[PDB]
Design a protein around this ligand. Sequence first.
Ligand SMILES: Nc1ncnc2c1ncn2[C@@H]1O[C@H](COP(=O)(O)OP(=O)(O)OP(=O)(O)O)[C@@H](O)[C@H]1O
Ligand SMILES: Nc1ncnc2c1ncn2[C@@H]1O[C@H](COP(=O)(O)OP(=O)(O)OP(=O)(O)O)[C@@H](O)[C@H]1O
Ligand SMILES: Nc1ncnc2c1ncn2[C@@H]1O[C@H](COP(=O)(O)OP(=O)(O)OP(=O)(O)O)[C@@H](O)[C@H]1O
Lengths: 48, 493, 547
Amino acid sequence: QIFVKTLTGKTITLEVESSDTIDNVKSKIQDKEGIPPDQQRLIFAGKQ
Amino acid sequence: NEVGYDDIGGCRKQMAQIREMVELPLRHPQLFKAIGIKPPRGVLMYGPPGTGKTLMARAVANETGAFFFLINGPEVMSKMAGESESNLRKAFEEAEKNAPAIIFIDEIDSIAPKRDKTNGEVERRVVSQLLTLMDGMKARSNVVVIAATNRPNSIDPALRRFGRFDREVDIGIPDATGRLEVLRIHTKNMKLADDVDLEALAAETHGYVGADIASLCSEAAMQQIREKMDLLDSLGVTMDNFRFALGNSNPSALRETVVESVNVTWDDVGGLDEIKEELKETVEYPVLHPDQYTKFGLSPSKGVLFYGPPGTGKTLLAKAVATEVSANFISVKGPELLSMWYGESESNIRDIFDKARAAAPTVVFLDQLDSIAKARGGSLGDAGGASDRVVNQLLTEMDGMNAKKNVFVIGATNRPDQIDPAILRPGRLDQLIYVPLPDENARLSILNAQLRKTPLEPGLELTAIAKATQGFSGADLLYIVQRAAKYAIKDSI
Amino acid sequence: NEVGYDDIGGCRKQMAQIREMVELPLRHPQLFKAIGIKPPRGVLMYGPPGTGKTLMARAVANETGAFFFLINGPEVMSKMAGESESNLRKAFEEAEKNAPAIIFIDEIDSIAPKRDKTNGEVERRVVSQLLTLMDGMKARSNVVVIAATNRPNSIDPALRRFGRFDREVDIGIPDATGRLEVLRIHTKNMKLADDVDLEALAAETHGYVGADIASLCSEAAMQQIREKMDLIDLDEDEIDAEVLDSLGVTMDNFRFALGNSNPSALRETVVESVNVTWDDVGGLDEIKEELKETVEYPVLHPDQYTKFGLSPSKGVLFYGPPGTGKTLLAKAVATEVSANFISVKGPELLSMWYGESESNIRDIFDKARAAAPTVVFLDQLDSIAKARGGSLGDAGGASDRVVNQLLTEMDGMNAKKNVFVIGATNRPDQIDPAILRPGRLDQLIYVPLPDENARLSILNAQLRKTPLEPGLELTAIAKATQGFSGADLLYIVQRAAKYAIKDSIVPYITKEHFAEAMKTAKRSVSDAELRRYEAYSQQMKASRGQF
Ligand SMILES: Nc1ncnc2c1ncn2[C@@H]1O[C@H](COP(=O)(O)OP(=O)(O)OP(=O)(O)O)[C@@H](O)[C@H]1O
Ligand SMILES: Nc1ncnc2c1ncn2[C@@H]1O[C@H](COP(=O)(O)OP(=O)(O)OP(=O)(O)O)[C@@H](O)[C@H]1O
Ligand SMILES: Nc1ncnc2c1ncn2[C@@H]1O[C@H](COP(=O)(O)OP(=O)(O)OP(=O)(O)O)[C@@H](O)[C@H]1O
């Protein structure tokens, strides 16, 4: 004719937010992004 | 802009303990290599808040010549991507490059909790970085680490090792001469009048701390400028401003551990002409003659169980015994029970048991015995492990405590058979003193005791009221005298 | 600075066990080829803190001349999960090419705690990386890994398997000759005085570890500084450098250092023995030679006692009149066989929080195997019946939390592990029949009324802790009580000694303190309870079953 009562407790979280390895950024630089319409980029030649 | 060196009073005993500890080996690399003993590289300061933890560390490090690397508790660990360890590694590396140095870690309890209250993963990463880097100072780099905390039980127990933190310095509450000394160094720049008496203020303020004494002088000056304001000529703080500050304010006992010494003198409980000789051998004779137990070899009985009739028995039969000591009384009571369902059941008592021998003299009163160990210690017990953690620390802290320092416990209840019989184990409760019912020769002096501050006409007979009281205890004597004061003010109405 | 054999002390018998266990795979691998079985790779040291287990690992590495590498505990957890596994892999690769080598790791409890109480993510990260690297390596490079902790069952139980960590080594506290050797190493540079005795300080600190002795002499040397504080102050920056040669730490500074210090590693009971003889209690000689026939005969002749098919006499009991010397005999039962012994009691050790109520009996089972021999003893068996429970009717049992771990492993251990349970109750009518069975308590040792005519010899060995009067009065002090044993005889002593605090600001002990003490001559143990069990002492053979 009796009872059992017990509560609980929690811990939410911690974070660091660590990212961006160096090998991904070196591949991130050597690319293209697009050029409007007529914004050619050119070639050039010389030094015969 | 910093504080001096002699701006701390009352803590002179702990000052001389710490002046030889952290100041003398810092300025003197000799007399330790010649003696062949390496100096300690860690100290720990703890005690009640508002006692001078953060003040004494800045005072002892300024006027000695040092580097004084300051580091705060909650300011670390608030970083991102795990750079609190690099802020700790650069802290100890830059200190030893320009030795002598002092690394004062303030609020270390907010950095290192116990391993059962761990939170996340960055809390484990900074307590193991501190334990590794503390061991790296064995090269005698003249670096002293000072750590200040508030709760020594909530800290991680792996910090007190041989080399990390060997010495601990406890800062207690000041006495009547100690609280008077802080009042001299707090009214230095204040314009005072002549009606003030600092000896009477220190004698009235018993349960005051090193921070409450700063509130007594600053509130009386704020009260005085609220009077003097009309169309800065004379602002001497008067006695009535300090008397008003005693009334509207309060000491640090905001339902915390109680700091008071409310005791009554003799002939305040009626009779006792054959019972007063039975109580003088338990709180006076271990204090007046301690050598009688050390010469023989007996353990002094620091505990006396009290039980009696209704009316009296709880406080006025126990607080009238310790008139000669008048120390701080830290008591457990009704609301001090299992309020938190996890941990804070006997951990609120662990700082009562361990501090009774560290902050001696300290008298601990125990009451409400039918609300702590009634069903748990019986034959039926507790089945499930829900709240069976109450009858264990009350018994295992008995054999672990010896009579090295001045400890004293008093158990009082209305039902002596409702408590567990292991509380009445031999060796701890060998002296059983029973307070009886006051007879006819004692009930007449009860009516002369609780009628103390009254304009009582001595022409009447108080014996004739007490002669009609046979089964009426001191509560019914209080009941028959409260109605005599109800119609007395009604005569003035 | 490097350490050798002389820089440690106290554990010289314990060090020799670790000596032959690690020097045979390092120096002479030809025994592996001859006997054809794999030598161990992982040892584990444990014990109380401050016993110099890290100093012993540096001593065994430099003297053998192997490639020593140290991996500390909290320095691994100070990093994240990524770089800690890379640092653990680099340590094992350099020791393989430098064979023979010793990879000593420290503080395995911080890396490997008990995992089932906190089912987490990082609790199986660094230990699973270690387990596939420890069991996974195989190159016959005969390298030894040494572990160190403070508790053997605090670590994860999967590490204590075959091939990974098999040999457990306990590091106990040093003896009186052992603690003397610790201070002699630390006082090589301490300029002590001539009055300081070497052997006197060993008997002073009974349960101090080597870390406590090293902090004791430094505090006593610091008191020598504060004693000479008024001679030369600190304002002069070492100007008077000619009086510092007269700095001798004389022996009462060590007496002051003992007065302020406290034992740190004595939060438990004794780990070695207790020493109180059967002559310290008066009489009871009719059971002295009787107990010599049941507990010291099989341990001296293990072949003739077991080749006849007789079971080992593992359990005895003490019963009779309640509280009549059996509580006094709680400590005087270990010195006969002089083995290891730890007393257990209901409100003492098994009434703690949940999870630790069975780990205390686990330590006496590690003492049956790793620290053999052992002696188990439980007193006041009628108070434990409230926790065990009483069987009612014809269908009952003792549904208790602690009796399941007790009764199963107390019969599985053989006679070579030297298990010895001792019982002592106050009334045999308050014994639970579910615990009693034929095979556990078949040895009857009846304790009679403790010799009230000869009880003057009991109190003669009780008043030897205080200088007393030479003209004693021992005419009828204990012969008129007949129910007051040596436990309750202290109350008569407390009657004749509580008056020292009174009549003070002189005689201390008079003859009237014992002559007038016979006014409270009462009897708590009446003769009505003794005569029920005096006939039971000759008829318990017909009632040695259920009740
Ligand atoms: N001798 C003294 N003891 C205690 N307090 C003092 C003393 N002298 C001055 N004080 C007052 O107390 C304050 C210093 O208290 P402190 O900063 O040490 O608080 P604490 O609770 O002791 O430690 P923490 O700052 O970590 O809480 C000062 O502002 C000062 O006015
Ligand atoms: N010498 C005395 N004898 C009897 N009663 C007294 C005496 N002096 C004061 N009293 C009155 O009797 C009361 C004392 O009662 P008390 O507080 O002891 O209650 P109690 O029920 O006895 O305590 P507990 O709750 O521990 O049983 C006080 O309120 C006081 O006014
Ligand atoms: N032979 C010895 N036996 C025991 N103690 C010694 C011995 N030689 C020196 N000591 C002292 O004991 C201490 C050794 O303790 P140690 O540094 O090993 O702590 P520990 O807790 O065992 O290490 P860990 O943190 O790895 O567990 C030293 O400070 C030293 O003064």
